[PDB]
Write a protein that binds this ligand. Structure first.
Ligand SMILES: CCCCCCCC/C=C\CCCCCCCC(=O)OC[C@H](O)CO
Ligand SMILES: CCCCCCCC/C=C\CCCCCCCC(=O)OC[C@H](O)CO
Ligand SMILES: CCCCCCCC/C=C\CCCCCCCC(=O)OC[C@H](O)CO
Ligand SMILES: CCCCCCCC/C=C\CCCCCCCC(=O)OC[C@H](O)CO
Ligand SMILES: CCCCCCCC/C=C\CCCCCCCC(=O)OC[C@H](O)CO
Ligand SMILES: CCCCCCCC/C=C\CCCCCCCC(=O)OC[C@H](O)CO
Ligand SMILES: CCCCCCCC/C=C\CCCCCCCC(=O)OC[C@H](O)CO
Ligand SMILES: CCCCCCCC/C=C\CCCCCCCC(=O)OC[C@H](O)CO
Ligand SMILES: CCCCCCCC/C=C\CCCCCCCC(=O)OC[C@H](O)CO
Ligand SMILES: CCCCCCCC/C=C\CCCCCCCC(=O)OC[C@H](O)CO
Ligand SMILES: CCCCCCCC/C=C\CCCCCCCC(=O)OC[C@H](O)CO
Ligand SMILES: CCCCCCCC/C=C\CCCCCCCC(=O)OC[C@H](O)CO
Ligand SMILES: CCCCCCCC/C=C\CCCCCCCC(=O)OC[C@H](O)CO
Ligand SMILES: CCCCCCCC/C=C\CCCCCCCC(=O)OC[C@H](O)CO
Ligand SMILES: CCCCCCCC/C=C\CCCCCCCC(=O)OC[C@H](O)CO
Ligand SMILES: CCCCCCCC/C=C\CCCCCCCC(=O)OC[C@H](O)CO
Ligand SMILES: CCCCCCCC/C=C\CCCCCCCC(=O)OC[C@H](O)CO
Ligand SMILES: CCCCCCCC/C=C\CCCCCCCC(=O)OC[C@H](O)CO
Ligand SMILES: CCCCCCCC/C=C\CCCCCCCC(=O)OC[C@H](O)CO
Ligand SMILES: CCCCCCCCCCCCCCCCCCCC
Ligand SMILES: CCCCCCCCCCCCCCCCCCCC
Ligand SMILES: CCCCCCCCO[C@@H]1O[C@H](CO)[C@@H](O)[C@H](O)[C@H]1O
Ligand SMILES: CCCCCCCCO[C@@H]1O[C@H](CO)[C@@H](O)[C@H](O)[C@H]1O
Ligand SMILES: CCCCCCCCO[C@@H]1O[C@H](CO)[C@@H](O)[C@H](O)[C@H]1O
Ligand SMILES: CCCCCCCCO[C@@H]1O[C@H](CO)[C@@H](O)[C@H](O)[C@H]1O
Ligand SMILES: CCCCCCCCO[C@@H]1O[C@H](CO)[C@@H](O)[C@H](O)[C@H]1O
Ligand code: NA
Ligand code: NA
Ligand code: NA
Ligand code: NA
Ligand code: NA
Ligand code: NA
Ligand code: NA
Ligand code: NA
Ligand code: NA
Ligand code: NA
Lengths: 273, 272, 270, 270, 270
């Protein structure tokens, strides 16, 4: 059937269909995703007063990230369960286009508003030395937007046009490397003039940032990471992609936010942990 | 088929239908729209005590704007996904009237209650000099209501009666120019007697206000901005309209509210 | 088609159907209705500490009114969109009984719990002089309940039995006049011993109360206000009724609550 | 039609069906029910700081009761509208089993967690004299659980097996009388050593408790209170049962909680 | 019918179907489950300031557990009502695969994020003596994750492959015994140098932990606890499993959280 510029989940769903395990696991992991975001929202609000006033905007931005992450990852989960329906004759879940096609775009538009806030919020905890606040912020915001927008365009072609898919992905990757570059500077300058305890947390934040953010391009490419007609161009690749996206989102948003909160505590002139 | 006084989204949906990209993008952008409003709601509540008591009503009004914006833009998003259904034979999304026709009216009624609050809330941060509070408020509220009501009537005719569409739009535009006039005065008087930092933020507020508010009439006209049978009388114009409305709403409500909060901080005798 | 004791919206929907404008406008105005109630909820909670402790129960009761008004007016909005479905052949929205018949009863049961709270809450801002708190409260609550219950019964017959409709409406009106009487006394006693600023706000509250509460019996009668087969026995009367109910509910609940809050501020020593 | 161990609402719905008034009223009253619970939730949270710290646990338990009452009574309302669908040919609402059968069990499981908290919370406001806190609590919790569980079992048989229905109901009634006994002692001991104002509120709490709690067994028996093929074995009995359950739940949870809060205020040193 | 690697609920539903009591009870108990979690959420937020700052993280983690437990157990309840539909001809609820198959996986993924937080939060109330905080935490988190993941895999095979089901379950059990071991040490070290009041609560916490956590493997095996074609390989086993899971979740999360809060109060210098 004609699916056009649709995600590979739909092609698997329309041809092989999904086993009970593939369909249920994807539903469960996407549901856990939005559930963790609302739990995180509660954590960030309830811990605001654990740090000095000057650091509380970081807790607030974490909470702001959680609210939209809950809503968009809730929509993403419903998109999954609505798009694939059980066939009694074969006992597998097949594309049910009456529920609309499945698209990972809900997650991407969450990134569009989260990336700017996540990159911004560290600047409310650490102090820059040589770099200008305005300059770092503007670079984060510009490259952040371009990275997500170019990737959003690319993922529509992940089956229909592999060339467009890889070119847009490559452009996205360029902006990604720029952000890694700027964030590395921010971490280094942030370490200057703070306790060894604070410096250790910033080191952990850099590792978390590096691993969690790198998962995303991996999830982007997932279906083709085992080449043409590979193991991952299957329900196994669908499960893998949705697991990785969910791990990345929890790591880049919630764990990132917790570590920043712990940093703010060590830098706080009143409180301690 | 007979659609009557219906938005052009329905005519595109009933003839050409929407590609995966056009349908999914519109769904995504409308969903982002209501998600940003609920995120904004949290931001405005959590930052209330960042400014002196006298400024806190501005945070409160921002929050009030967010609550209804979330609800109305949520309804608007559901209206989209319910009104267009995938056709397996051609692989495009076509008008599914069992979900009702699509209408941008949910967004308009949000404007009706938001415009008065957005125009009002700046008067809790800045001090007027030459203008009377009651006079400015009454002009904002009267012209604000008339602008939205006349526009709301017009958009029903955007396909069925181009003349009614453009006349109501023109009347709406008149009230719009009046509001721009009054708000310009409010900004100028607000700058008088405050720190240069506060004056700079008010300058940014004026630019944001001018650009964000002008996007609306653009979105109103979107389908016809490339003339008869133009590039925008298509799924591309639908995508463009819903993107512009979403950008305008985020800018005029959330970013506006953040800048007013930042102004209140600079004017606050405790914070800096 | 047998509709029995059903609101006239269903009869219009089953015969003429609704134009795009009539259906969409009604959907939009009913949606705005519940949206304003949730916005009001936030306003009343966030402004609690703007008045002295003794006045804060009024903010609390406003908030209590908003919560149930949001839920009931949300249900009322869904009742509308579920009950009328687009017919592609004629391009109008017709009664779709699979969604149940439309009934204004959700709004009425909101009134049942709101009327007592709205009448009660002014007694936490103003001080009575010659009248006893308990006596005024008991009169408000008894007449308030009877007014809503008798009206609720009446509106089921607004098409099926014009006599029952008008008799129950008349009984309801009697209790309404009693409430107007008691509220007038409350306003007068409330004005005694407070600043001219406070007295002005109470005057505005009385005008708001009088206009907003009178809109309701108007919305009750709406379909027949232009007589048999008049202009209002149509989709135009449906639009008019739902607009008036929404204006009345916003005015009697939210604007009323804001004015009471502003009164509390002027009467506040802080 | 084979309905098995199903509530009588289904048998009425499957045979006579429900008139517009019977269906709409039941929908409205069940909706009001959950709407009042969420409004109550707001009231109990916003008034926590109106009493001394030692009494605030009572406000908290009221709020805890409201949250689950909202959710369960919301589910109960949706169960009603989903189970009965309009038939255009006769103009009545008939059992639509695609929506599942209607069962009052959502309300019962709410009782299971509410009864223990409602009986418990008064022990945070009044001081016992003869009785031990732990002992009264344990009696309330044990008899409360058995009362609801035995009743929950019984109501499944209210049509399929009148004997099982009446026996389980009788066992439930025994636990009910035990609770009335213990609560009476608690009220009496609570009156000892407090202001006459506090004693009057406790008297009102006892009357509210006695009337509101006795409504439940009445609603249990409702369909048969006019005997075989009586007036109440009808849509009129369905309306009556759902009205009584809603009045009882509002009274036993919200009004009870308000009176306890008012008692806590009179006993408060601040 | 071809169901593949599906839970036994689906096989009962596809063959015998469910009686009114079995279907309604399961719906009610699953609904109570998520309702208790949201009520618990309110309790934990409202009691945060009842303990010294250093203990408040325990209240916060209880609340965090409640939020996701509400959402996941809500999804689990909807999965039940969507998967089984009334058949009018036989009067039983049969598998309706248009609603997707029923899977207990929503509950398992709640465990995945809850187990780490529940094991973690006690370390914010008690003080270790001989054991290192980081070491206990890392063991809890590693074994906690492996226990849930291995169990999650196993339950997909509970009908399709009894060997895989029992082997994965056995591996899960190994990690379970490790956690019981570490938690026992934590309780013992926690008792050292604290008031008798604190020691009593920790004893109660250990009993609650031991009983509530052991319910889970019981619910895992439920269908086969009476052997092949036993009493429990039926709607009675489905009811039993969902009851036990709901009791376990309430006990391990809410009651556990309340006891930890009570411990924090006794250890609080205010
Ligand atoms: C599987 C992954 C699980 C994700 C689910 C957790 C959900 C929300 C975040 C919970 C926050 C975690 C608790 C942090 C506690 C902490 O780091 O310490 C407190 C700090 O020292 C102050 O004193
Ligand atoms: C096609 C391949 C594209 C490769 C893009 C790679 C890097 C772009 C980085 C450019 C980011 C510059 C944005 C403007 C900016 O950040 O300005 C600094 C600020 O003005 C000071 O205060
Ligand atoms: C505004 C940005 C518009 C982005 C322009 C979209 C480019 C689409 C694209 O790259 O697709 C190539 C080809 O059509 C695939 O077969
Ligand atoms: C910010 C920088 C903007 C640059 C955009 C160009 C990238 C668009 C690349 C689109 C590639 C089109 C393509 O690959 O077409 C293949 C053709 O259809 C045969 O397979
Ligand atoms: C994360 C994203 C990383 C992607 C970067 C990988 C390659 C970029 C090279 C530019 C793309 C041009 C290659 C086009 C191509 O490989 O086309 C194969 C085949 O013709 C289609 O059917
Ligand atoms: C063609 C369309 C016809 C439709 C007709 C639409 C009429 C305009 C509606 C409202 C204007 C609002 C007027 C603003 C004046 C408000 C007065 C005020 O602000 O008073 C506050 C008072 O001081 C506190 O007590
Ligand atoms: C934002 C709205 C801005 C209104 C724009 C112009 C005002 C024109 C006033 C009315 C002019 C009527 C022109 C007309 O009716 O044109 C019909 C014809 O079909 C056309 O091609
Ligand atoms: C502030 C008060 C506004 C008062 C009247 C505006 C009425 C404007 C109505 C314009 C209707 C245009 C029309 O009727 O269309 C002509 C023809 O049918 C095209 O094909
Ligand atoms: C206030 C309600 C104002 C409602 C006014 C409705 C005006 C409609 C209109 O402008 O008429 C164009 C249509 O094509 C003519 O048949
Ligand atoms: C059928 C025709 C309808 C006729 C229209 C009737 C209008 C007047 C109704 C009631 C007046 C008084 C009712 C009072 C109800 C008891 C409460 C009360 O007033 O008692 C105060 C108490 O003593 C604390 O001070
Ligand atoms: C007590 C009020 C009851 C009024 C009932 C009524 O007016 O009935 C009219 C009659 O049935 C018309 O045929
Ligand atoms: C407050 C905002 C409201 C805006 C919404 C407007 C809805 C119209 C409402 C009432 C119209 C009443 C008009 C009545 C005048 C005609 C009287 C008449 O024609 O005669 C009566 C009849 O013949 C004897 O049975
Ligand atoms: C069969 C009929 C049984 C009805 C007997 C009535 C008393 C019930 C319980 C008393 C238990 C006393 C408290 C137990 C605490 C544990
Ligand atoms: C009172 C003691 C409990 C009464 C239990 C017996 C109920 C009964 O007698 O059942 C009626 C009849 O058998 C059904 O048709
Ligand atoms: C302490 C709790 C009581 C424990 C057990 C009582 C169980 C006995 C109640 C069961 C009654 C069932 C019954 O009455 O049987 C119906 C009979 O078949 C007519 O048709
Ligand atoms: C609260 C639960 C009350 C339980 C039992 C009280 C009823 C005791 C009276 C027993 C009546 C038995 C009965 O009425 O028998 C029905 C028979 O079919 C006639 O024809
Ligand atoms: C293939 C079948 C064989 C598999 C059967 C599995 C049996 C598991 C038994 C015990 C778990 C003990 C696991 C050890 C936990 C290590 C925790 C950890 O990684 O953290 C280190 C911490 O610092 C402390 O030393
Ligand atoms: C220890 C950590 C993981 C256990 C990894 C060991 C994997 C155990 C798999 C056992 C299994 O899958 O069972 C085979 C099945 O019986 C075929 O018929
Ligand atoms: C809770 C977990 C309880 C696990 C107990 C089973 C112990 C070892 C697995 C041996 C597998 C036995 C395979 C033969 C059974 C069969 O295939 O029938
Ligand atoms: C979509 C077209 C609208 C763009 C308006 C640009 C704003 C400029 C006003 C100064
Ligand atoms: C004093 C104790 C009595 C309380 C009243 C309870 C009455 C219950 C009967 C149910 C009502 C039936 C209505 C038809
Ligand atoms: C850098 C990572 C990009 C790897 C590109 C691999 C190209 C895969 O090629 C594609 O494989 C699909 C799955 O088998 C097939 O359905 C397509 O026909 C084929 O074009
Ligand atoms: C200020 C912008 C308004 C200019 C109005 C342009 C006139 C548009 O003209 C309209 O274009 C539609 C789309 O092609 C056609 O379907 C209509 O038949 C035609 O009337
Ligand atoms: C106070 C206003 C009440 C006036 C009652 C006027 C009588 C209404 O008359 C009614 O009009 C309907 C619509 O045209 C007709 O369908 C009914 O048959 C007719 O009874
Ligand atoms: C305390 C009240 C107990 C009274 C129970 C006895 C009434 C049983 O009467 C029942 O009435 C039903 C409806 O009319 C019939 O369908 C049943 O056949 C009949 O048993
Ligand atoms: C508790 C761990 C041991 C349980 C193993 C018991 C063996 C169950 O055996 C199974 O019983 C099912 C139910 O009757 C049958 O349908 C299956 O065909 C049969 O393999
Ligand atoms: Na987000
Ligand atoms: Na599905
Ligand atoms: Na708004
Ligand atoms: Na759709
Ligand atoms: Na209300
Ligand atoms: Na509709
Ligand atoms: Na409850
Ligand atoms: Na229905
Ligand atoms: Na959880
Ligand atoms: Na069902």
């Amino acid at each position: 059937q004609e699916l056009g510029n649709a995600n590979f989940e739909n092609f698997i769903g329309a041809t092989e269909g999904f086993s009970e395990i593939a369909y249920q696991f994807t539903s469960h992991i996407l549901t856990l995703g939005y559930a963790v975001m609302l739990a995180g929202l509660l954590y960030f609000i309830l811990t605001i007063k654990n740090v000095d006033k000057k650091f509380q905007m970081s807790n607030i931005l974490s909470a702001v990230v959680m609210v939209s992450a809950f809503l968009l990852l809730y929509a993403q989960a419903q998109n999954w369960t609505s798009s694939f329906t059980f066939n009694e004759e074969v006992g597998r879940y097949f594309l049910d286009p009456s529920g609309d096609l499945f698209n990972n775009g809900y997650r991407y538009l969450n990134w569009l508003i989260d990336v700017p806030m996540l990159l911004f919020q560290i600047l409310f905890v650490v102090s820059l030395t040589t770099s200008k606040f305005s300059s770092v912020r503007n670079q984060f915001w510009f490259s952040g937007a371009m990275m997500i927008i170019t990737g959003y365009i690319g993922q529509f072609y992940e089956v229909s046009n592999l060339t467009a898919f890889l070119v847009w992905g490559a452009i996205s990757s360029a902006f990604f490397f720029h952000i890694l570059w700027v964030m590395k500077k921010v971490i280094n300058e942030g370490k200057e003039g703070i306790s060894p305890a604070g410096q250790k947390i910033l080191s952990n934040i850099w590792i978390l940032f590096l691993i969690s953010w790198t998962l995303y391009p991996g999830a982007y490419l997932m279906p083709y990471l085992t080449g043409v007609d590979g193991f991952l161009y299957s329900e196994d690749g669908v499960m893998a992609r949705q697991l990785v996206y969910t791990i990345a989102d929890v790591s880049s948003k919630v764990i990132y936010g917790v570590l920043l909160g712990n940093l703010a505590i060590t830098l706080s002139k009143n409180k301690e942990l």
